[PDB]
Amino acid sequence: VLARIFKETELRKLKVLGSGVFGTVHKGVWIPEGESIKIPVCIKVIEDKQSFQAVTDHMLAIGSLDHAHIVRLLGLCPGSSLQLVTQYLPLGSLLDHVRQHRGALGPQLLLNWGVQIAKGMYYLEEHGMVHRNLAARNVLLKSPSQVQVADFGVADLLPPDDTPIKWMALESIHFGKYTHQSDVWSYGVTVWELMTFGAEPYAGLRLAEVPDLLEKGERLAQPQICTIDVYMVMVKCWMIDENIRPTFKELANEFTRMARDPPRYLVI
Ligand SMILES: Nc1ncnc2c1ncn2[C@@H]1O[C@H](COP(=O)(O)OP(=O)(O)NP(=O)(O)O)[C@@H](O)[C@H]1O
Ligand SMILES: [Mg+2]
C-alpha cells in the first residue's frame, strides 16, 4: 500500500499520443538518479478544470496495484497538474487492434482476451478498486497475445463534474453511483466491442435516447460471430438488477470454459 513519487526532473515528454475524458497521454522518457539512462514511459496529464499538489489516499490505492493483466502505475508526480506515469506499450489499444486485423484474429486468441480482461478486473475487485471507465480503448496490448486493463480509478481523482455514457450501467447514469457491479456492465459492452471487431456501441443514436432504449430492454444487438451462449454472457452484464449480474469470478470461468474448444462458441 504505497506509490512512488517522481521528481519533475526525472520525467521528460517527447510526443503527445492523444487525450480522453480526463487527461492527455504523452510518450516520454524517464531519467533517474542524475546519470543518463533512457526508459520509455507513458505520461498522462490530469488537471482540475484545485491543484494536485498533495497525494490523496486514492492516489496510493491506484499506485499499490500490480497484476499480470493490469497496466501498473509505476509512479506519480504531483504539481499544478497530476502526472500519471505508466510503461509504454507500442502495440497500443485493443480497440484499434481489432479494427485493423478484425476477423483474421484467432477465435482462440480472441477468447483468451475475454479471460485476460476478467482476471485483471477480478484483481481490481479483490483490492476493492472500482475502475469506473472500462472500455476497449482502455484495454491495451502488452504483448501480441497479452492484454492489460488500463485507466482504472482515474475518474475518482476529480470532483463530480460533467462519451463513457455508452459504457455506463443504468444506475450509474441515473444515480451517479459506481460499484464493482457497474463495471461488470462496462465489461459487457467491452466484450461486445471485441466481438464486433471494434464496432461503435449504439451507433448513430442520440445520447439522450440511450437511457430509454436499454431501459425498454432492447439492449445491444447480437454480434455476427457470437453463438447465443457467448451472447448471453454479455446479456447478464446488462441486467437492471446488479445482484444478478455476474461476478468477474464467473466471467473468468465461462470464457475459459469456452476457450477449451474455441470454434464451438465463435465462428468467422
Ligand atoms: N501505456 C500506454 N502506452 C501506449 N499508449 C497509451 C498508454 N496509455 C494510454 N495510451 C494511449 O493514449 C491515448 C489517449 O489516452 P486517454 O487520455 O486515456 O484517452 P482514451 O484512452 O482514448 N479514452 P479515455 O480513457 O476514456 O480518456 C489513447 O490512444 C491510448 O491508447
Ligand atoms: Mg484511456
Ligand 1: residue whose CA is nearest its atom 2: 88
Gap from CA of 18 to ligand 1 centroid (Å): 7
Beta bridge partners of 26: 16, 43
> Which residue's entry shows cell 500500500?
1
Task: Provide the annotated active-site residues.
Answer: 133
Distance, CA of 226 to CA of 255 (rounded, Å): 13
| Probe residue for ligand 1, chosen from 137, 167, 189 as the CB with the greatest number of ligand atoms within 8 Å | 137
Please give the Cα distance from 266 to 79 (Å, whole number): 48
- Closest atom, ligand 1, to C-alpha of 88: 3
Per DSSP bridges, beta strands 23-30 and 11-19 are antiparallel
Task: Tell me whether residue 136 is annotated as binding.
Answer: yes
Find the 103 Cα to ligand 1 centroid distance in Å.
24
Cβ neighbours of 66 (radius 10 Å): 10
Distance of alpha carbon 67 from alpha carbon 158, whole angstroms: 25
Domains of the chain in sequence order: 1-88 (3.30.200.20), 89-268 (1.10.510.10)
Indicate the resolution in Å.
Answer: 2.8
Please report the sign of the dihedral spanned by the C-alpha atoms of residue 119, residue 122, residue 126, residue 127. positive
Q: How far is the centre of ligand 1, averaged over its atoms, from the C-alpha of 91 (Å)?
A: 12
Asked if residue 153 has its Cβ within 6 Å of ligand 1, the reply is no
Q: What region, left, alpha or beta, does residue 116 occupy, with left being phi > 0 and alpha being psi -120 to 50 degrees?
A: alpha
CA 171 vs CA 154, 175, 177, 231, 241: distances in Å: 20, 5, 6, 22, 9
Experimental method of this PDB entry: X-ray
